[PDB]
Amino acid sequence: KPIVFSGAQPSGELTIGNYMGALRQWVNMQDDYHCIYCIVDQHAITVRQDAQKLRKATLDTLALYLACGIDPEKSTIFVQSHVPEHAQLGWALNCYTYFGELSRMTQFKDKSARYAENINAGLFDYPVLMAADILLYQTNLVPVGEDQKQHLELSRDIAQRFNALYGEIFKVPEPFIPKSGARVMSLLEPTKKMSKSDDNRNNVIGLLEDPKSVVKKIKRAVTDSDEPPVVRYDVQNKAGVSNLLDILSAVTGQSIPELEKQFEGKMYGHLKGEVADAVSGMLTELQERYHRFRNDEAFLQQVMKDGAEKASAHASRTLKAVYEAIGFVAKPH
Amino acid sequence: TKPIVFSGAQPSGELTIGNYMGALRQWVNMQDDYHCIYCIVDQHAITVRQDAQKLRKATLDTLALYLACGIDPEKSTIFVQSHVPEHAQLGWALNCYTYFGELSRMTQFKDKSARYAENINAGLFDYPVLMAADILLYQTNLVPVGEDQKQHLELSRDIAQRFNALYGEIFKVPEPFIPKSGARVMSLLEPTKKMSKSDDNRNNVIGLLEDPKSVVKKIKRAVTDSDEPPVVRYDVQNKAGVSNLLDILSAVTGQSIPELEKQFEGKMYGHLKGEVADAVSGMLTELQERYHRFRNDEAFLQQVMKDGAEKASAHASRTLKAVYEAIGFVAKPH
Numbered sequence A: 001k002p003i004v005f006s007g008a009q010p011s012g013e014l015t016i017g018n019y020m021g022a023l024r025q026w027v028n029m030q031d032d033y034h035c036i037y038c039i040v041d042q043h044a045i046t047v048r049q050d051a052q053k054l055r056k057a058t059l060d061t062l063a064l065y066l067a068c069g070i071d072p073e074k075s076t077i078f079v080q081s082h083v084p085e086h087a088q089l090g091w092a093l094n095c096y097t098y099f100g101e102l103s104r105m106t107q108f109k110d111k112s113a114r115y116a117e118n119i120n121a122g123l124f125d126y127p128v129l130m131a132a133d134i135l136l137y138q139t140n141l142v143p144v145g146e147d148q149k150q151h152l153e154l155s156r157d158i159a160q161r162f163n164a165l166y167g168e169i170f171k172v173p174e175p176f177i178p179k180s181g182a183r184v185m186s187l188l189e190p191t192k193k194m195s196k197s198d199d200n201r202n203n204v205i206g207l208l209e210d211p212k213s214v215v216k217k218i219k220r221a222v223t224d225s226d227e228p229p230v231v232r233y234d235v236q237n238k239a240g241v242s243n244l245l246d247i248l249s250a251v252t253g254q255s256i257p258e259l260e261k262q263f264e265g266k267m268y269g270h271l272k273g274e275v276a277d278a279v280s281g282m283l284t285e286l287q288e289r290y291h292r293f294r295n296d297e298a299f300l301q302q303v304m305k306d307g308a309e310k311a312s313a314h315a316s317r318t319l320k321a322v323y324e325a326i327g328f329v330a331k332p333h
Numbered sequence B: 001t002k003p004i005v006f007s008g009a010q011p012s013g014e015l016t017i018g019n020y021m022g023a024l025r026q027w028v029n030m031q032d033d034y035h036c037i038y039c040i041v042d043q044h045a046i047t048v049r050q051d052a053q054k055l056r057k058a059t060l061d062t063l064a065l066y067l068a069c070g071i072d073p074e075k076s077t078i079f080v081q082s083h084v085p086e087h088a089q090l091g092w093a094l095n096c097y098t099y100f101g102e103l104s105r106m107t108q109f110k111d112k113s114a115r116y117a118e119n120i121n122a123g124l125f126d127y128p129v130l131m132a133a134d135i136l137l138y139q140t141n142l143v144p145v146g147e148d149q150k151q152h153l154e155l156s157r158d159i160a161q162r163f164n165a166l167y168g169e170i171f172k173v174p175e176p177f178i179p180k181s182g183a184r185v186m187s188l189l190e191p192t193k194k195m196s197k198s199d200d201n202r203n204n205v206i207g208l209l210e211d212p213k214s215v216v217k218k219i220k221r222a223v224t225d226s227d228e229p230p231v232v233r234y235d236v237q238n239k240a241g242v243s244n245l246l247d248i249l250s251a252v253t254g255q256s257i258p259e260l261e262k263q264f265e266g267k268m269y270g271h272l273k274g275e276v277a278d279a280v281s282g283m284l285t286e287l288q289e290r291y292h293r294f295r296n297d298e299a300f301l302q303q304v305m306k307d308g309a310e311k312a313s314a315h316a317s318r319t320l321k322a323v324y325e326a327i328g329f330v331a332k333p334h
């Protein structure tokens, strides 16, 4: 049974796209793979932010993942900084990573533009820590979005390079190739995917938005001039309408041919009304689960404590072999 | 509580008399006056590719060399860097408070880049930040280092002040402790070049574990100025070889530079190199007798490492917990 590792940023404002795409897909596969979810608070601090907000967002992310169906009995979920092995292997893998490999990262060069005032060593060194995150757990599979592909490739390079010197210490991870299938596009830019990182929040529906705000953003979702207004799937002529159908279908399960006949003789106004109802209905159940988890501090502590302990048994095993291989004197027990 | 001293050396190569005069001598001298913590920085060592068996042996060699020099485990915390996870942990956190430019301007990074151009790795680049972590973890007041670590030490003051300015007095701002004499021991055949463990010309280098007979031969061959007449006078700029030899003899006898200048009045360089030779030969001979007694007792080495890591961890965890609270990490449930 393959080991899967995902990093969860304790700062991402997750959208319905995240939830009905990757998250829903992985929630349904917790018994097929040994899934590990790691809230990467050590990665987060490469971008400076309020300390209290980072603490709060670490817990928000924990409760949100739980509300989405991550089951801490089936999967391992934990906070990165709670397992010191991440930093430890992070340092040691620096010594097997070329400076040039890090310099050629587009994530570093792109994030240098956005944060030209904090081009800090953490921003530069992020891929090595990522590499350590993955390799500690003998990970077979990493779901990555497009802008993490090069980071995963470095991880595979580091694993192979390290193995070539010392033996099969790490598993070489593979990208998880199949995509969720749900199509959720930006509400004003329906050629671009709805993204949690959009600075234009009116493109997205965040997982915690209330129904009044959902209607606001859906009602302003772009449509087509087509006279008469016809609810028909056409990603090039009627993308906006096609996006609303795709989102509704992702919410309800109804097929696109079913939805077309559902809205036969209906206007663009009612289609948005049905989308908002379906989306807010979905978000209302997620939200009540979120707040039940989120307000239960003892529960969240127990999850964090149990997850870190599960992660640690694997992480320390790998780090022990790493340190033995590199040549350190073992810590006297 | 006494003010805290922290310093480290790599279990790489063979420690030199430069390592002794720039760092190790002051470490011994400070053990009573301050609370001293001394580290074998094996995680720093691996920034230069090392044979794994040699690295493990070098760690034990270095520890026995500390003990031979007079570092006393009942006065000083002595410990191996990789035995205290908090060094790696604070290293990462402080990465996020260090500017890329501060690391690319590092003289040591550039020098090691040219020398290990086949292994210009991120550890070599990130080196100063882990060093910063090594120091700041212990609320360190003083860092006894040679002159070549000054830039590294100054970055760690910058990092500490930068972090404190955001978060309160989490760290002490450390101060360098760099000796007036012997901060930059020079190469015997090229006294304009610092004496370096990695020198391929071994006639430049006095090894602390090297055969005293070979050391005497190298010191007798040390190059000296062409002053006419020869005069044994301390002048590091114009009389580099002679002054370096005066520093070295000073480090063995404890006589001041002016007492040695008065002692060598009417004496020439041949007599000088002879005295330095006999003095260093005596010191290394006694050093190596203590070295082997410590080094051949691996169970003692193991006990020192365990006691030291445990003493170090108590202090490092206390600092790391405060760092984690300040930057906003959820604390690990206990």
Ligand SMILES: Nc1ncnc2c1ncn2[C@@H]1O[C@H](COP(=O)(O)OC(=O)[C@@H](N)Cc2c[nH]c3ccccc23)[C@@H](O)[C@H]1O
Residues within 6 Å of the ligand: B006, B007, B008, B009, B010, B017, B018, B019, B020, B021, B022, B023, B024, B041, B044, B130, B131, B134, B135, B143, B144, B145, B146, B147, B148, B149, B152, B182, B183, B184, B185, B186, B194, B195, B196
């Ligand atoms: N020719 C010389 N003359 C005088 N002093 C010299 C000479 N060559 C070396 N030194 C000093 O010896 C110490 C050990 O050298 P390292 O190369 O191990 O030094 C190094 O590699 C450090 N980065 C180890 C370290 C890691 N973390 C620390 C924290 C505090 C202090 C030191 C450290 C050093 O003090 C060095 O300045």
Ligand SMILES: O=C(O)[C@H]1Cc2c[nH]c3cccc(c23)S1
Residues within 6 Å of the ligand: A005, A006, A007, A008, A009, A040, A043, A129, A130, A131, A133, A134, A142, A143, A148
């Ligand atoms: O930015 C992101 O989402 C990445 C954050 C991250 C840190 N460590 C890992 C390991 C696997 C996958 C990811 C990460 S995804």
